[PDB]
Symmetry: C3
Subunit: 527 residues, 3 copies
Amino acid sequence: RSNVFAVDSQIPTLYMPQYISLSGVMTNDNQAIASFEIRDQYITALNHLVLSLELPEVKGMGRFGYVPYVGYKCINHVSISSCNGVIWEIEGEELYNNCINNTIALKHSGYSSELNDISIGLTPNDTIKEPSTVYVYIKTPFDVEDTFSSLKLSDSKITVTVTFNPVSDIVIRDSSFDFETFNKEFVYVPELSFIGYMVKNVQIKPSFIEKPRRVIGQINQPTATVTEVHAATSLSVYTKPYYGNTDNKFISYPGYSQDEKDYIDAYVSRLLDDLVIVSDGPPTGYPESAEIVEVPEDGIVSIQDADVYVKIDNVPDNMSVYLHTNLLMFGTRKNSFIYNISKKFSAITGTYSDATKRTIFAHISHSINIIDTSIPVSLWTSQRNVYNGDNRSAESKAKDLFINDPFIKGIDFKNKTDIISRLEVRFGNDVLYSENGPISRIYNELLTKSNNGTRTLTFNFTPKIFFRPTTITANVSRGKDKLSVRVVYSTMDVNHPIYYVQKQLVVVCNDLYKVSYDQGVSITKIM
Amino acid sequence: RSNVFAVDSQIPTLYMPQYISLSGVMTNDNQAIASFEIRDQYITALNHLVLSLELPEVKGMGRFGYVPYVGYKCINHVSISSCNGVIWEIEGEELYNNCINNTIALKHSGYSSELNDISIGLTPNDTIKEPSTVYVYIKTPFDVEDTFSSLKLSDSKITVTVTFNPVSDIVIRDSSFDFETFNKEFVYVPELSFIGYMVKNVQIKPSFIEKPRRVIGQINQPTATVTEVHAATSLSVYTKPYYGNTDNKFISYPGYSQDEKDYIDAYVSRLLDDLVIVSDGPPTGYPESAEIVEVPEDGIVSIQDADVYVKIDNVPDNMSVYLHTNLLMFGTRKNSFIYNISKKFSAITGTYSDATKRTIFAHISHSINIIDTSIPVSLWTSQRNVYNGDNRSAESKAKDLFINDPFIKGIDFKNKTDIISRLEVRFGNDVLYSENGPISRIYNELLTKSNNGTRTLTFNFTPKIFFRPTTITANVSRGKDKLSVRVVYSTMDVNHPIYYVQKQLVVVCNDLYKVSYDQGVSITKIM
Amino acid sequence: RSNVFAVDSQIPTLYMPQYISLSGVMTNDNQAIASFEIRDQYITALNHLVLSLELPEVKGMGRFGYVPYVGYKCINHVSISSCNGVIWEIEGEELYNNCINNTIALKHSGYSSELNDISIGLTPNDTIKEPSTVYVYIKTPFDVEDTFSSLKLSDSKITVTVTFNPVSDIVIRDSSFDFETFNKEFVYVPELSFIGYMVKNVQIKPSFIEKPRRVIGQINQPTATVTEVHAATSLSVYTKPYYGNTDNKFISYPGYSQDEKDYIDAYVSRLLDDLVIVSDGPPTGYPESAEIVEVPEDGIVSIQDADVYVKIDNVPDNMSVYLHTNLLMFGTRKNSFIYNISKKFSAITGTYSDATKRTIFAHISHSINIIDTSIPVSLWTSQRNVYNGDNRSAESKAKDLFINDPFIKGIDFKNKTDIISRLEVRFGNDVLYSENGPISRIYNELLTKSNNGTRTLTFNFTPKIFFRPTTITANVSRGKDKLSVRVVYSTMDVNHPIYYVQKQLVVVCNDLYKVSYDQGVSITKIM
């Protein structure tokens, strides 16, 4: 029988860990780049890199906030090199995707009301945000099995290089904020930390590493190809919106609250102030194409098959209640179907306030969804729209927000709508995998215990470090040395504005490398 | 010293995984049954079964929603067989209990506002629910240790058989919905997915598997027995309500929100409309046994020792505020104790609305609990009640809901009340285990890291796949070959309606089987 | 190739587990102590200790609730001994810190609305709390690797000793509650449970254990030292507030809701009733130093550079709205800076209610923070304050709460403010570690997957039970045998009341011991 009530304690290698901090050299659309040099003969190994960033004080007028997870979304590229060349590098989006299921890391990177609420400044000396510090955990393959997987610095110099996104990507602002001055005075202030191990009589062996590689397809094309694929551990596919043909303005943003319901509530709250008006006579200050009708005594207004029920309490006797019946409208033919945001409401109740002269709304019944919240403003007024799209007031138009978040997936802010209806993967000339529903995404989420998985083919099911990973292997004789992806996009109604949001296909392939430690550290691609 | 900074990477078996999808054959109270045949010489092993279901579009009038986790609660029985007979099978409740701690699987099975809100249809062409798809992860013993635990198809045919519950179990509806037509036109549309492994030169060994077995006791009896127990790894005990002697109608249901507080708020919101009435003269439309009194100037109404404080703002000068002092009442003797739902309120405030002619309530102080929310309507008006139990209005009575959820435990919707006061387990003739408090449930939750454990005796503490599980073993000579369970139910007040909810004892025993792969796959019960 | 599709199942030691329950002997500021004796020749090993406590029914008048996690916070000290002396012991705070990341254990210890809401009693026979039972999981080193790590009772007697905190520590109450009577009649009722293993032919080996050791520095001193440190696995540093120079009264407490936002909302709700008053003529019942001004027609009141916007709806025509412009004020010089709580509000809206004669507030804009919510009442009226600090009404002053929670860290209830600006650790005479930012806390949280980490130096990265832990080792020749900690506290404004909250430095060191089982169980400190 095997003893399950006692073990023989082995004696491990003699070592001592230490937390080490380093300052870097900054160089410069003059993209900012920081380089850090690690050179110490007593550091035998290292892992768990953490980057810290000091965000400065922001003063002035207007509305301003940071995007959620600002620390992660400010990073464009990270590279780790030695004298033999690059050892490992990655783009910001792949790092974010790898860390998306680590709630503590996400929270450390900057996720709080103080950073992400959209604050308001009233005078040029008002303080909008106080200074603070965020930390970015740079997850690497060297962390998966603690000491067993650490990177050995075989008496070489290690350089870490961080490339930063332009500050316009991490800021959410309205048009009143003095962004040009802010961008002129903003500077990145970084510092790198890691755990070092001073080891006595270390015994080094060769090991195994996976390096991600991203390919981005052409605009609106449904194909993409990764070349020179000889030993890959997985393949992922997803889509990104392209907002380069717009002005990047949006009606609302919820800030720190990030549920779907929160998005919808922020949107509805922004529309309600212009949708129902209590006025002495016909309300003024709206464009000529607005159709504002007076609410009858029974409270029901008809908008061609759609009925809206409006009841406001405490309305002054010299005033009436009006309903904006075409607040936002879009169509491609003069007498065809119309997408009308006013028709998405069925019941509106509330009470007029004499002291503040505005309506405080209570219960709302509606059918707004995340796609409606994700339509960009410039598409409402594009050239293909045969109507005047934006019939809002000037005060409402002055509250629109610029949003340039670089890691958005799908065509909405939550990646909730699935726009891929068929996926087909070819390895060489033959079909390797095809599916209609998102069964591969379901399997990805099940196997990784994540809520935000992607369509992923996994080829490796063996334990990570103690076994060589299982791969799909090339056959250059038959020409099996490339992976081509082809999708079929879902069909949308030609009269919905979201039909004209452009998209790009993204393919991610994880290639296998061999790590050898003779003549310091070097890698060679497994073929 | 053992090296903790390097390992020797072993080379694993050469294999390649693949996602596979299959359609099935449907046959038919004409219970629906689907059978799926897996036959491919290149599939060496498989695991991670996932069932997908397409739910159709629902139109018409009335109120309609799906129960939470509809995908899991639609399954009655799953069986896996070969030519040598059944290999593994399980009932829906055991599968649900095994997956209850997997939040991602639960969410994939169908848990969202679009499915579980109680939606309303106004015209016979109104769309209540849009079509959608859910996925059910069928957790099997072959998943616990990935490739190590997978099922080997030794050149045999594998059949998966799914038996479905009648659609009445998964639907929550009011009496206005045309359920007979819906049930006539509803059809299950299933598809099975799994991960297959094509293996090169596989080396097969015998392995170990546990098969659950359920026994249900007789109505209201406090005993149950599992026979032919020779090697069991665990034993569980819990209770189920039996609603077969009622009409299955309930006053309220919270829908997507599933906290205890949410249940209570939905219940209170449904009662408040009938409990406080603003009327011109004595309110009409209530049964003759209602005792509706006018609220005095100090706002305090006395109901025999109980005092209710009622203050409503903006009451018209030609109207008064009334309180229903016996909205629901139950008692067994004419002058004994009375359970009166009106006496569970202590303070009620709000404001009358002239525009909508209804009261919008603000702060409520009450002592309603989950048992009150879980009493079925038919028990309020049973023959043993000496009063007229339901003194609500017809409009309120028309909003009651049918609920037939098949996996309810305890006597309330959350299984919060513990109705077992003593548990005694006998193996043969001698006492094997007895307890007063729920210390075995506490231990179950601690060891499995679950929030919804049950009273469980665990006999196996060894690692799952690399060791033979530890069991309690029979001794047929002394007659130790049966487990008999006896409980003592808690004592309830004879004047509480919940005292008359019937219950059944459920015992679950996990038996050990041996898996051999000679002459294909076959199992033999370990004795 | 290594087989990854099959294993050889080893046969483990023959054993059988059993749940065992024991009653104890109670002895007695007459601190209560319970001792439990475990003596049974058939119990070979044990682990997973669980303590149960019955809390009694509480009746009377006033406001009363239990602190969150009452079961954990009622324990002062736990000790495990045999005839050779103490084997393992720990203080309540170290146990709490070790279990803080186990949500299920925390919830079992007593975390619910029924226990932690601040309930109200109206008559001397009112029931404030119903009886209930909580369970405290006493995490020990013997649990980390189930059977492998269990404690072997080599035919010796084991004694478990629990020392309880005085009941004043676990109760939150107002001054109306009859605490002297409650304390006279309260008694602890404990019971110990554990999992025992009856083992056949056990094979015992020596093993390894870590024992925590706490040192508390002197009041306001920024140093502390742990002597006789020869082999430590980690070191932790944090701070505690000392409320011994106050009366322990606080303005508000949120109860069951424990987010920062919840603390702030409870505080703001308590202030609003005294901050804005609707009255017929100048409001009465406030101290003479109150400066209550009438709100002008534009609704803007100026308080020296600060502007407050006040608009209340439905104000009677014979009444006006007043604002309390110095509700709480503190300063050290007569004409210097002033900390004024009235100036932390910028906008206040609401509606007066004629039926209940009070204001129901709606939207509030403010800058209150957790430090404001954590200032004790007695510091507002200390001798160093040159103003009268508390200008509240008597009704508001009668609602203050005593809070004596013994495990508070930092200077606020959430340990959110970081008051350590520099930390320096010396081992012998040389600097072992120094940092400015909380990078060691970040690393602690990353490595332990916790949201509530502390500043911690970790010396052991090897797997726990199968390897001897790695340590920092003494060198008594050079005098490396002590760890001295020195911090630099952050600088606060001399006109903020929180500057005068006293604090203590806490250092925790984990020493290594050897466990041998010859002559029963005994330990010897590793040197």
